[PDB]
Amino acid sequence: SMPPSNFLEIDVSNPGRGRFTTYEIRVKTNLPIFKLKESTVRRRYSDFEWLRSELERESKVVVPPLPGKAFNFIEERKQGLEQFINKVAGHPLAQNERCLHMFLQDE
Numbered sequence: 001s002m003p004p005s006n007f008l009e010i011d012v013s014n015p016g017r018g019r020f021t022t023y024e025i026r027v028k029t030n031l032p033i034f035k036l037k038e039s040t041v042r043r044r045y046s047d048f049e050w051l052r053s054e055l056e057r058e059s060k061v062v063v064p065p066l067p068g069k070a071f072n073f074i075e076e077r078k079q080g081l082e083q084f085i086n087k088v089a090g091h092p093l094a095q096n097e098r099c100l101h102m103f104l105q106d107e
Contacts, residue, residue, distance in 0.1 A: 001092030006031050010089055010104070012082040014074070021045065021070065023081060027104055033095055035107035045069050047103060048081060051088070054099035061094045 011026040022042045029037055045066075052063045064087045067080025088094045089104065101107050 001095065003031065003092060008086075008089060010082070010085050012078050012085065014078065018071075019044065019046070023078065025085065025104065027089075031095070034101070034105065036105050039105045039107075041104065041106055043103065045081075048084065051099055051103045055088070055094060055097060058099065059093050059097055061088065061091055061097075063088060 006029070008029045008031055009027070011024075013024045013026070015024055016022055022044050025041050025043050027034070027036070027039045048066055052066065055061045055063055064084050065080075066084055067077050070077065085104075089100060094100050
């Protein structure tokens with residue numbers, strides 16, 4: 001894939017305990033492949049792990065690193081999660097995958 005002049009912004013932000021800790025993930029885009037041009041979802045660390053495994057199973061994408069589970073601290077982790085999901089979602093191979101869209105939009 002080679003996409004047209006487009007934008008894709010994904011933000012990871014805090015606004016639970018342990019396994020219930022979640023991150024708000026906000027997507028703004030004009031890319032037609034996405035069902036919604038603006039969205040918010042709530043995801044856990046483990047959903048990022050899940051995404052990485054789906055992608056290794058179903059694609060040729062080389063998935064960037066994840067920052068480490070929690071088990072200073074939280075803000076480094078957020079920034080890691082944000083780099084990760086932007087690189088992946090930027091990848092036109094990952095854009096083609098049902099797992100990325102489920103992760104990003106519930107769609």
